[PDB]
């Protein structure tokens, strides 16, 4: 909702930001990685995650919120059976905040009723924007991490490190969040030349013991338009201001 | 990167230096002991300390650096859950500089995002060498304090002063730094003759209020080759020149 252009003006400084790299991790913009365990609640971890980052950035406070509370009360979704990023933010506004991760611990696939009263300090969001398929690097630089969707292939799970550029999935089947971009200049193992390999920085929800400390890097170009595997086809970022 | 021999040659130089004792503490080479508390920051405190000494020596400046920024930003380590000296030095260079421990105070196990911008005067290192497993005393005398590893056994810890000697090694499980050696001449409790007891000087991270102002003495021989408990299996010294 809202209007990209409408908010980007209120934040963006007209300065053709550095398009090669910016990493929210090393700017107090990325909360610790969590682990969805055996429940298909990706949609929830990513949306919750983008909110945590909005807080860590804007209102400068670190707080982990209950993903479990979304799986239990977001009726516009299907709990462990999947959901949609934007629906989450929707139900988030309806619920007027979510209980901290501490008063409403996560319990994965274990049946669990929805109890909104399990706490008294609910953390919420004023509204949420949608980012244009070709304004990712720009939004990431001034608005913050973005909740997005992507097609995850079977080999995608084995990824242990580097700049993934493997097989993609059928269609958009997973929700993760974008936290920044970077660019390592590797050598052409064949021509042996200074080549520039650009990449996006993803935060998964499979615990730290997966990929680079829980994060994965996706190839892309300087412009930040090469969205491999359908990258950010669906892209939203919550707003608390 | 820098491979030991290239720089060690630029410094060592044969020399019949006294192999019995040299103590960087009383040569303006050892900054005050710190306390990692109930957070597994062995590796960071050890590496940081060697940097503090390098500045205190080469650039004749007394400076204490932020261990908290390493636990939060190297990513080649696992914050309070442990890490490795060399990984730290790597990432230290990647980040190009570290906040002083005053602009980036330590908060042990207390959650804390990584903000490389938490300061404006960042102190760094050009590169880092690995010192030979049988060249410690030699290195200490000319290169400066060394970051090392050791196996702390269960009966240790009560040590309040003197030259602790009791626990044996295993696989390692803690990170500290070597700061010098000495040799006290006790009397022969059996034949009563002039016996020579050599020892190493380690710099811990459990505050001044522990042992002799925080330090402990480990047995060793004149050659500086008897590394009980693996003393220095892994040994590195950062370089700022
Ligand atoms: Cl974990
Ligand atoms: Na985790
Ligand atoms: Na880093």
Swiss-Prot record, chains A, B:
A motif (Arm motif) lies at residues 185-194. The active site is at 42, 174, 204. A motif (Nose motif) lies at residues 1-17. It is found in: Vacuole; Membrane. Auto-cleaved to remove the propeptide. Disulfide bonds join 39-80, 73-114, 99-119, 168-229. Disruption phenotype: In early trophozoites, the food vacuole is swollen with the accumulation of undigested host hemoglobin; however, in the subsequent stages the parasite recovers, and parasite development proceeds normally. Induces expression of FP2B/falcipain-2b and FP3/falcipain-3 in trophozoites. Cysteine protease which cleaves native host hemoglobin and globin in the food vacuole during the asexual blood stage. The binding to host hemoglobin is pH-sensitive and only occurs at acidic pH. Cleaves ankyrin and protein 4.1, two components of host erythrocyte membrane cytoskeleton required for the stability of the erythrocyte membrane, and thus may be involved in parasite release. Preferentially cleaves substrates which have an arginine or lysine at the P1 position and a leucine or phenylalanine at the P2 position. Component of the hemozoin formation complex (HFC) composed of falcipains FP2A and/or FP2B, plasmepsins PMII, PMIII/HAP and PMIV, heme detoxifying protein HDP and falcilysin FLN. The HFC complex is involved in hemoglobin degradation and detoxification of heme in the food vacuole during the asexual blood stage. The propeptide is not required for the folding or final catalytic activity of the active enzyme. Belongs to the peptidase C1 family. This is Falcipain-2a. The gene is FP2A.
